[PDB]
Design a protein around this ligand. Structure first.
Ligand SMILES: Nc1ncnc2c1ncn2[C@@H]1O[C@H](COP(=O)(O)OP(=O)(O)OP(=O)(O)O)[C@@H](O)[C@H]1O
Ligand SMILES: Nc1ncnc2c1ncn2[C@@H]1O[C@H](COP(=O)(O)OP(=O)(O)OP(=O)(O)O)[C@@H](O)[C@H]1O
Ligand SMILES: Nc1ncnc2c1ncn2[C@@H]1O[C@H](COP(=O)(O)OP(=O)(O)OP(=O)(O)O)[C@@H](O)[C@H]1O
Ligand SMILES: Nc1ncnc2c1ncn2[C@@H]1O[C@H](COP(=O)(O)OP(=O)(O)OP(=O)(O)O)[C@@H](O)[C@H]1O
Ligand SMILES: [Mg+2]
Ligand SMILES: [Mg+2]
Ligand SMILES: [Mg+2]
Ligand SMILES: [Mg+2]
Ligand SMILES: [Mg+2]
Ligand SMILES: [Mg+2]
Ligand SMILES: [Mg+2]
Ligand SMILES: [Zn+2]
Lengths: 869, 4, 349, 176, 4, 4
């Protein structure tokens, strides 16, 4: 079994709208395609003993005995590696359950599709499933050590990509509120929202956190000075530049119960909490002295409380207590530690509520100061601390006290956050009773913290958990405001680029910044950002991440959808223009019914409050209306189309071409926008395919709320001139002669241009172009089309590229054109550059010549030799 | 989109 | 503009306005400057990644963790005209601007190697322009040129330095417009690379540089070019400031012509700076001075808004405390936060 | 707090006094079966529809003889709630809970028993419910619990000794 | 240096 | 470190 190709999908796609995270593996069963399980001796017992957990899988029968039964039956291996890749991820805690298989290409090649949680772990599990299954169809088993090492690699891959818990907390609430989110390429930042409404976060810091507030909060001496000048209670204390001056400093504080800290930070290290004697002060000094250069603060009694303030308003309060044991019967300290460290709520870290208590030299040091050691028996209800400070990560506890805080203390905490200048802040308070004013209990404010963590508030050991994230998202995205900008997505086999540029032009008349992507470039308000084929999810992301964009208009191609899914999840308007047989055989899409499922992805992601715009003159497109959860609007070139009539009778909206006008039917009323003859993109009203694109753009603008007058202004001033849209209807006036340069690909474009030619109000109709060798066997069809339109048909297909042989393509065109109508001066010339398109005076005055060149760049350089007007 |  | 101001007790900060309308500044940083924008702007590799993903032109280049890999790195860049920087900052030090030979690359390495761990960027031609953007809007543009002398007659370099260093507009620092040109080992090193030394006579109109980089504090000049910048270049600069996330930002641009689009002159954006200085814009050596502060105060105190809160002051020999408490009680009935001081205490609500 | 009219003012004629009044910002209307059976509802649609209970009173009047019929009269309120609004149902009442399958609006539930299977199934799908638990009246919103107050400290409840008053307090808190 |  |  070989893997030929792997795709990673990230967004709504062909296989599923909801299952956004999928891996598609193209698997070649070189062997096994001819051996349906029962032809592989031992491949049942080996599979169940290596992976005994492959039991719950229902596969297709629908019950718990569903899979495995299918292994006893003649199931092929490409359907089995799919249940192994899912199981290998489940065995390491990553839950995934979706999967499918399809046969493609020649017999034996399959598409294996499965769900992933982590992108690298997903691809890893796929490769591993193939190795496991291949060994078992060769030998009868798989070494245990070759299974355990793979499970170890999956566990590491899924750990390395994890978001920290403070970001998980914000992201989860954002999803509940339907706010889109993305990871950014730098500094572990996350973006929330689109375009002009975007916000950024990094853990517990945000786009609203100022630098001056954050730096002041990290300066302990600066913070103390600012707060005491505001009348806020802080500890009494001084500083020494590592001189042996403690004997004097203690005198300013007022006595020996003092606190000695390192003069700078290095985590919670080097701190002595309650000094009572000179010799203790000396020991405390030598330890504090290890760091860079308050040392003697007065010691205050009370508990350690953490207060969380988010936007100048109190959110949560928690009381923190250090790891300890108590006189829970007449047991020793070592016995008590083992007794409580068995509690089911303790273990590891962020895995459970509490962690384990660890005895180390620092636990011994803390106990010695209390008069105890491990072999001592405690008196009933005596409490012994094993740590100097509280922390959940070291085995302490946290108690919710949010509803017990006095109204005056609430006022003071909010004032502290505003004085320093922080949006999200943690405040460290020492007090004996949080339910009484700090001035009565003689409490103090010890510290202010920028970017505080949330674990003690969202997962307390006692009391009720609090939703901390909700107040954060409320300041970033205040109630009543949007987090998204309008998205207009355009798809279909032909006409996307033209429709996209017109629609962007119309929105631009409102004065907003409009960004759009097409197959030519990425633009913002008429400035080019990038050039080249910019369709696909990577370009859509440039516009959506751009801080200036107010409206996004995106042309969407099948290549991008099949390769990586859609970039945006949902949109306001989804436009489907047509389904036609181009690009068949590529991407495993062989039929027209399948191509219709690819295009329908846009219609199915339109938000229920939005609209789908469908072509009522197209049988595959109109049919999509029964899949759409959104409202449906229709357009047509025929006012009598039964769909349109049935729809407006139920008070729907439609756009039709009638009486020379482009108009909107809204219920019983008709709104005329303009005449086809007065809209420049339509060639004097003689190009039906241009009219149809204008109708789709006008209807999309209308259903999304633009006024009719704005729409009229936009269609009247929109141009598709030469050197703006090369290769797309470039008509040149060259003496008493006209010639058109275009670039049809599939046959629908040869017909669309042919209709323009039929309507030419002049003399002879000539054609001077044709298909290259990259086409399927449709040369006769293309020849038949030319024969129905032109009276000067000259065959050219023996070009400079010559993808296949020489002039055979031209001969096949000749067979087609003479089959349909052997009456158009059917010369074969082959030289498309200095003959076919040079002897144009063979055409009667004011006739029309249509060029379908291999390259429009050359065609528009050559047409110019006649001095166009 | 329903399951394996 | 009649906005009251105070110095604060910590970190050299200044307060502007009273009560609920107060703002703070520290040099060129303010109460509206975010931390994520400021930290991103100080990360050269982070800044480059974010901007090129947005379609913004930046220099081509790579990184080496102080291994002798320059001989290979030059191949990704595309040839020897390269720039070698220390891999971290230490003021404007340890940088070689135009390497042309292998031996030069080695010398540049040993110097760059002195700092913590881009090293081989492509070298681009053009002048060094500084663009100042304040609230997503362009304020000023200045062209910067390093200390130099020219072929102002058939004189030697040492004579030319003494001739121009006597100019009445030069001296000390922030005392006058320009400072003095100082000859030191670094001036000699810069001249040796140009084929000159102090005793050489220059050809008419020849220009010799005495410094590797422009700076007014080292004897260079600054020319106002604010009205010469092309509309497309204005759009691009404003977009750069918004992508990074800075309110007040300086942008370093290398281009041969600021009046043409950067895509036509093949120019690049070299750097973004949080908290930029203003001297070159408020005291240029050529052109007109610009009032840079006015756009700053307009974002902090938008037109039509107050910078002060109402103050009611009560005095007289007898009755002040009683009058003060009653008046505070009356304002309090409107639902506002009222602060007051008396001979008994300081109160808020 | 000013009285406009006195007497039994339920029914569509009184609802019209409030809806036509140029000063009113919020309308709270008790709705009786007499008014519905005699002349229909006065307002067509509403934002919140609260159904407290169905019980066998007034049977035999107005051609409503059975409890199943009385339930169809009460369900009129649940069925006129605008799709963007909510229906508030009693999960401890078998005829009322069953109305959830007729409602086009969102559904919220209340109960006096936190372990009611309906409530549990509902909050697991991120719905909203109000329950009486641990002496508190609280709101369950997804995985989070919001405590409002203690039953003993709410004066309408007779020191926490009147279960029927607690149930009415839960319905009012959830609607708000 | 980010969950204080 | 403040007038860049
Ligand atoms: N003057 C004081 N009186 C009584 N207790 C104090 C005093 N100062 C600090 N503490 C306590 O000692 C501990 C020291 O916290 P500190 O202010 O020094 O931050 P830190 O130790 O440097 O960093 P970390 O919070 O991560 O431990 C806190 O738990 C606080 O409750
Ligand atoms: N319904 C249609 N609308 C516009 N052009 C059409 C239509 N049907 C056929 N054509 C012809 O085919 C050409 C398609 O050009 P266009 O760029 O507008 O479609 P496209 O979807 O962007 O192709 P691509 O996949 O390369 O982007 C036109 O120039 C025209 O000659
Ligand atoms: N790739 C490059 N091509 C041409 N010139 C460059 C290139 N990179 C930098 N420079 C120039 O060299 C100088 C180096 O500036 P740099 O980006 O390294 O900031 P710095 O030197 O570290 O700090 P400072 O601005 O204070 O000197 C600038 O004057 C700039 O004009
Ligand atoms: N015009 C006056 N209004 C109020 N009290 C007066 C007046 N004249 C004399 N008194 C008397 O003198 C006392 C002044 O008290 P009061 O606190 O109001 O004035 P004061 O200006 O605040 O004095 P202080 O300078 O100590 O603050 C009153 O209690 C009253 O008995
Ligand atoms: Mg299947
Ligand atoms: Mg602390
Ligand atoms: Mg195509
Ligand atoms: Mg296109
Ligand atoms: Mg610089
Ligand atoms: Mg006095
Ligand atoms: Mg007084
Ligand atoms: Zn299966």
């Amino acid at each position: 079994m070989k893997i030929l190709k792997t795709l990673t999908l990230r967004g709504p796609n062909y296989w599923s709208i909801r299952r956004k995270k999928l891996i598609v593996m193209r698997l070649d069963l070189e062997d096994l395609a001819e051996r349906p399980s029962n032809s592989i001796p031992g491949f049942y017992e080996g599979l169940i003993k290596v992976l005994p957990s492959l039991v719950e899988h229902f596969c297709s029968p629908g019950y718990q005995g569903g899979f495995l039964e299918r292994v006893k039956e003649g199931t092929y291996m490409g359907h089995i590696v799919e249940h192994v890749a899912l199981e290998l991820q489940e065995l390491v805690g990553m839950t995934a359950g979706f999967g499918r298989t399809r046969e493609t290409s020649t017999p034996g090649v399959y598409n294996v599709v499965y769900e992933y949680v982590d992108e690298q772990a997903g691809r890893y599990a796929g490769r591993a499933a193939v190795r496991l299954c291949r060994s078992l169809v060769d030998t009868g088993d798989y070494p245990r050590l070759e299974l355990e090492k793979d499970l170890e690699d999956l566990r590491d891959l899924g750990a390395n990509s994890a978001l920290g818990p403070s970001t998980e907390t914000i992201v989860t609430e954002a999803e509940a509120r339907k706010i889109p989110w993305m990871l950014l390429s730098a500094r572990a930042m996350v973006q929330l929202g689109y375009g002009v409404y975007q916000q950024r976060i990094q853990a517990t810091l945000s786009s609203h956190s100022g630098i001056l507030g954050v730096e002041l909060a990290c300066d302990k001496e600066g913070t103390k000075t600012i707060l005491q000048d505001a009348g806020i209670p802080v500890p009494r204390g001084t500083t020494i530049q590592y001189f042996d001056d403690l004997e004097e400093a203690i005198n300013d504080v007022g006595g020996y119960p003092v606190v000695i800290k390192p003069l700078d930070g290095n985590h919670g290290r080097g701190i002595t909490i309650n000094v009572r004697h000179w010799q203790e002060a000396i020991a405390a000094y030598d330890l504090a002295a290890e760091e860079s250069k308050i040392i003697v603060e007065r010691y205050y009694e009370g508990s350690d409380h953490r207060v969380l303030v988010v936007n100048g308003k109190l959110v949560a309060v928690a009381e923190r207590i250090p790891a300890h044991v108590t006189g829970d019967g007449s047991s020793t300290i070592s016995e008590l530690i083992e007794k409580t460290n068995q509690d089911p709520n303790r273990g590891d870290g962020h895995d459970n509520i509490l962690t384990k208590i660890v005895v180390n030299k620092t636990a011994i040091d803390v106990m010695e100061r209390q008069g105890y050691n491990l072999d001592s028996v405690l008196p009933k209800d005596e409490v012994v601390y094993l740590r100097a400070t509280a922390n959940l990560s070291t085995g302490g506890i946290a108690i919710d006290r949010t509803d017990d805080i006095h109204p005056e203390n609430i006022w003071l905490m909010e004032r502290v956050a505003k004085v320093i200048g922080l949006d999200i802040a943690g405040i460290d308070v020492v007090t004996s009773d949080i339910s009484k004013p700090l001035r009565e209990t003689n409490g103090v404010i010890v510290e202010v913290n920028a970017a505080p963590g949330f674990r003690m508030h969202v997962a307390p050991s006692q009391g009720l958990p609090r939703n901390v994230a909700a107040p954060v998202l409320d300041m970033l995205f205040p109630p009543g405001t949007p987090s998204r900008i309008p998205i207009l997505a355009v798809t279909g086999t032909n006409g996307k680029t033209t429709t996209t540029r017109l629609l962007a032009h119309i929105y631009r008349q409102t004065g907003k910044t409009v960004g759009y992507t097409s197959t030519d470039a990425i633009y913002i308000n008429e400035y080019c950002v990038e050039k080249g084929d910019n369709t696909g999810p990577q370009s859509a992301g440039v516009i959506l991440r751009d801080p200036t964009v107010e409206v996004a208009v995106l042309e969407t191609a099948r290549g991008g959808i099949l390769r990586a899914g859609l970039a945006f999840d949902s949109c306001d308007v989804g436009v489907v223009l047509n389904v036609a047989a181009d690009h068949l055989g590529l991407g495993d899409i062989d039929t027209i019914e399948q191509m219709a499922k690819v295009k329908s992805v846009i219609a199915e992601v339109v938000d229920p409050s939005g609209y789908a715009v469908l072509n009522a003159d197209d049988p595959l497109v109109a049919a999509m209306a029964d899949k759409v959860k959104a409202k449906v609007a229709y357009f047509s070139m025929n006012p009598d189309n039964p769909i349109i009539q049935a729809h407006v009778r139920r008070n729907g909206i439609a756009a039709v071409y009638e009486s020379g006008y482009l108009s909107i039917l809204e219920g019983s009323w008709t709104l005329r926008v303009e005449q086809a003859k007065l809209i420049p993109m339509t060639m004097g009203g003689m190009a039906p395919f241009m009219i149809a694109n204008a109708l789709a753009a006008c209807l999309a603008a209308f259903v999304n709320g633009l006024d009719v007058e704005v729409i009229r202004q936009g269609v009247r001033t929109f141009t598709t001139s030469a050197e703006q849209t090369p290769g797309r209807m470039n008509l040149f006036n060259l003496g008493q002669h006209h010639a058109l340069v275009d670039y049809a690909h599939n046959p629908a474009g040869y017909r669309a241009v042919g209709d323009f030619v039929k309507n030419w109000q002049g003399q002879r109709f000539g054609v001077v172009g044709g298909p290259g060798d990259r086409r399927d066997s449709d040369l006769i069809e293309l020849g038949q089309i030319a024969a129905q339109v032109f009276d000067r048909i000259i065959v050219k297909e023996d070009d400079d590229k010559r993808g296949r042989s020489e002039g055979e393509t031209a001969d096949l065109i000749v067979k087609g054109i003479l089959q349909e109508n052997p009456g158009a001066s059917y010369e074969v010339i082959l030289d498309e550059t200095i003959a076919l398109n040079k002897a144009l005076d063979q055409v009667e005055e004011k006739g029309l010549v249509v060029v379908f060149p291999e390259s429009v760049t050359r065609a528009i350089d050559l047409i110019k030799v006649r001095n166009p007007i | 989109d329903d399951d394996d």
